[model samples]
Target: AQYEDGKQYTTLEKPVAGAPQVLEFFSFFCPHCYQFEEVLHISDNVKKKLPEGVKMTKYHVNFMGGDLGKDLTQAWAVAMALGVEDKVTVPLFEGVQKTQTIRSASDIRDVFINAGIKGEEYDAAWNSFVVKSLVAQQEKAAADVQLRGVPAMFVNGKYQLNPQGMDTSNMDVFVQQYADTVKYLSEK
Candidate 1:
């Protein structure tokens, strides 16, 4: 279904000028989110559909009511801060979802190292005051939005695209549908 502006998405209190900021709020431990990653390889389409000046990001959900969730959230922010999200994101996700190998912060640190993060870089990012501050900001944003689930997408910080209710019986059709919805919301 095409996203209905008022129903599927909403306007923010204060919208940013220019291109929209598209976001995917997710958790590494969430199996459905893992499936979304595994089943929907729609990044190419998402990139093509996004007009120039549009910003896209994956925001790790901070309130999973568990230490593992908090650790992964912090680790995700650190990866982004260290400029290694592209390198570490998939591996970290797979490590937790598929391999179930990441059980602690140390295991996460090892994932960073294995993903080519230098010792000093990892140390700096993991322990940096900047990283902590950025994580705090991200956490507050999620809370402010009252995010309660993973694999949720938002456009322009106002409209939320509900992938949960998206008709996914047909993968090909759903891919195009989802892509078009994103493009339409972003351009709107």
Candidate 2:
């Protein structure tokens, strides 16, 4: 939670830096993240019913790309640097999903603009050093987090579980129980 020393602010800002109870290591390119998009409706419903001080942070894992993955982070880093996270949030997700067909800033910036972020601002953010550093940080985080795979999750910076790895026989049970599991882990 305290950022794991040097690991802090790397790929992600240490999911628990803000003391969040539920932290999710997700990738913009991962279809699981896309699939989770629908589950979010339920996740949100669960969240709304939460008692208090329980929350989730979405950390974009860029380590999945290898050489081509470098650009995945570039898009995200710039968005944070530009202080336009809210502006480009949805667009960044869309950009990652398009990795199959679109690659490079030229293509990604357009998505940002369409999402309501100004082209010039997005351009400037893309070129800033902070964004570059953030992207590089992600490479380190992938190793630090020891993610067995994408869409990994941690509760209170301690317990970790991969829905993909467990209970292959009960998808509905796992999804429905995920929120309760997180809450239980955090409070423990």
Candidate 3:
């Protein structure tokens, strides 16, 4: 199905199919997405205990990569190409969050390699049709949406507004709040 204008569409398994939809807007370099990693971890645990239909789609926002656009795109492309988006998604965010090094495509590749994807495959997807498609779609979405920053979120196609109080500083609070919010909103 075609996604709504400016929204990244992903077909999730459970929690999503059975419950309300979560559109998790993110960026490879967004500090908030990284800070919320622990919250996501706790949310995963909560997911196990929750009933079905509560699903989330992680939308990786591309801020033109800034000075690292090409590198970031290539890195994200390789990860998706390696068919390890789920496995390496969180780890990659962590790496970006923890490291002081300048984020580069090479760094992304190294992380992928550590996750068991080969360099050759990485090279292939760096310029592959699939990667290009994803990039193009994101570009279209970027053009369509009016984004103020990365690491934003939308629930059921509506931007999820908050006081910007959650981050690495209070991960448990953010995750629990997010999950609870999802539950409450889904009921609406």
Candidate 4:
């Protein structure tokens, strides 16, 4: 059907604008997502091939770690708003993986400090309106999609990519199809 519904992707009833958008929904608590980032380096592989004007955004879904989930998400939003997502991505995930126990937001903030990001500015970013608004948008977008799990991607806020629909056994095939599908749907 339209937008390859019931196949490669499922069309949403509410398709958002920002037409060349690639939204990735994930959480630091998800091992699969960590694998996707560190082990597979999916973004590095797929991002290079993406067309210009294709804006890629990440949303840290506030669904894991109970009460601490939102705190973790807030930290992610701060990292992104500060334009330091690339610098903090691996450190943040590794911090969570190394300990396997994040007791509080300070536990999360310490990683940024270790990454050479000043604690004062880091805390400032956390409390900044930029991070606050981003967190609200992240929360609202997550609720709007209601995806079954993390590691989900939606193109143009309409076409949801189905990883199972592709051949994950072959990394080359998976990455190829994933990138190809993203480009396909991202095209206006």
Q: How many residue pairs clash per model?
A: 0, 2, 6, 0
List model 3 lDDT by residue over 103-151, tens digit each: 7767777777788877887778887888888766555443444556666
Error of 2 at 174 (Å): 4.2
**Lowest lDDT 10-mer window, candidate 4?**
1-10
Model 4: per-residue Cα lDDT over 1-188, one tens digit each = 43366677778888766533788888888888998888777777668888876667888987776767788899989988888888888877877775565677888888788888898899889899988998988887877777668888888778888877776887777787877777777774
**Candidate 4 stretches greater than 4 Å from native:** 1-4, 17-20
Name the better of 2 and 4 by lDDT. 4
Give the runs in model 1 whose Cα sits over 4 Å from its true position: 1-20
**Residue 37 lDDT, candidate 2, scale 0-100:** 55
Question: Model 2: residues >4 Å from true position, as ranges?
Answer: 1-21, 38-51, 81-100, 136-140, 164-174
lDDT of 2 by residue, 1-188 (tens): 52222221122344434334565666667777666654443345446545677766545675666644566567767766666656665565665674444466577677777777787777777788877787766555555556657666666665664354335366566565665555555556
Q: Write the per-residue lDDT of candidate 1 for residues 26-136, one digit (tens) a residue.
A: 888887777666677555467778888887777787666389888888888888898787788778779888898988889989998998888888888878888898788
Best model number under lDDT: 4
Best by TM-score: 4
Ranking by TM-score: 4, 1, 3, 2
Report RMSD (Å) for each prediction in the order shown: 2.8, 7.3, 7.8, 2.3
